[PDB]
């Protein structure tokens, strides 16, 4: 019920993917995105991993939305939305890249 849901996106290589993750009952925990390498991207509206393509699109208590510009084949895979309630509930998004 307070579990985040995200939908897989799919992008032509070189494009910008928009990853979106939202929560109905946030139980006063922050969301976060990690990349397929368990490496933190955005925790709330605070940027973590210093990459320039990766940019923030929304940070309201109920949604975390980021955009990875100029996508490349090495940006495919499972991005983990985490909400830091107890227990920590996760939601995965599978980026697929078109072109080569």
């Amino acid at each position: 019920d307070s579990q985040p849901w995200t939908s897989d996106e799919t992008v032509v290589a070189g494009g910008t993917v928009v990853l979106k993750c939202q929560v109905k009952d946030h139980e006063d925990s922050s969301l976060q995105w990690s990349n397929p390498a368990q490496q933190t991207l955005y925790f709330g509206e605070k940027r973590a991993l210093r990459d320039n393509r990766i940019q923030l699109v929304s940070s309201t208590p109920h949604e975390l939305s980021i955009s990875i510009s100029n996508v490349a084949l090495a940006d495919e895979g499972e991005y983990t939305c985490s909400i830091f309630t107890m227990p920590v509930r996760t939601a995965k998004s599978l980026v697929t890249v078109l072109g080569i």
């Binding site: 976060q32 933190t40 991993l49 210093r50 107890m86």
Partner: protein
């Protein structure tokens, strides 16, 4: 991309500190993740609703967090991710230790004299596996040890056998156990007090060394035995005890002795391992004329 890994140990239930050396600090985001890659602290902010983790020092030199109430489910790589370009990891691998629990000594079957004793000793939780040594009256006994790993922890056992007479009863046997979670040359110990059964022995001691007519004598039967014997029977050969004799428990009370109350009296006691009998030759002295010495 660089990865450096220190090592870090706890005694179970204990408290561990994780220092994240940072060489020179610009100010960039610092994340810490449990081994499930779940972020404890994104920079200062707590981000796992588990309050055993507290944040101590965040100083241009290092970051330090503390896990209180360590469990075996808290081992693994603790990631310290410093987010600059490029990123730099510090992985502190936590190893949690169970110091051996108090040894438990049991005897297989009852120690009987002449027979043998089978003593065992079991640490049920050790990490690393323990070492069981046996000591008896400050010498070491040689055992037959062998463990088994029920998860991350070890139950070890060690079973010594030796021979016992009645001296050995009441005697102390020490099982001590030690491993790494305990200072070098320390140990937990457990002392088992032997219990050897033995066939009884009786012996009579008298109230007076010289018994004269019209005295009251009390004989006493000085039994030993394991089990101790619970009944004593008093006898005067094929003859009745003096009337007025009081055979009560472990004492015969002869009062108003008269020269016909002479004879050899016996006390007789037994347990499950044997019998015993002792024998007092009663002699009532008089002012009459005696054969010469």
């Amino acid at each position: 991309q660089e990865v450096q890994t220190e090592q870090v140990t706890v005694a179970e239930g204990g408290v561990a500190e994780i220092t994240c050396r940072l060489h020179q600090y610009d100010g960039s985001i610092v994340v810490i993740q449990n081994p499930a890659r779940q972020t404890l602290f994104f920079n200062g902010t707590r981000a796992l609703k588990d309050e055993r983790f507290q944040l101590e020092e965040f100083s241009p030199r290092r970051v330090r967090i503390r896990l209180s109430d360590a469990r075996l489910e808290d081992e693994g790589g603790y990631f310290c991710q410093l987010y600059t370009e490029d990123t730099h990891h510090q992985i502190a691998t936590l190893t949690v230790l169970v110091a051996p629990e108090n040894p438990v000594v049991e005897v297989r079957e009852q120690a009987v004299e002449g027979g043998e004793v089978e003593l065992s000793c079991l640490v049920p939780r050790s990490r690393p596996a323990a070492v069981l040594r046996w000591y008896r009256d400050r010498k070491e006994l040689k055992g037959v040890s062998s463990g088994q790993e029920n998860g991350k922890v070890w139950s070890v056992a060690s079973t010594v056998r030796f021979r016992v007479d009645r001296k050995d009863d009441g005697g102390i046997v020490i099982c001590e156990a030690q491993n790494q979670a305990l200072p070098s040359g320390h140990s937990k110990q457990t002392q088992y007090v032997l219990d050897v059964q033995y066939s009884p022995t009786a012996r009579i001691h008298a109230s007076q060394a010289v018994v004269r007519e019209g005295d009251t004598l009390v004989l006493t039967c000085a039994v030993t035995g394991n089990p101790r014997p619970n009944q004593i029977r008093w006898n005067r050969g094929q003859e009745s005890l003096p009337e007025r004799a009081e055979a009560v428990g472990e004492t015969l009370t002869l009062p108003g002795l008269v020269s016909a109350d002479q004879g050899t009296y016996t006390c007789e006691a037994a347990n499950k391992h044997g019998h015993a009998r002792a024998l007092y030759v009663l002699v009532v002295y008089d002012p009459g004329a005696v054969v010469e010495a």
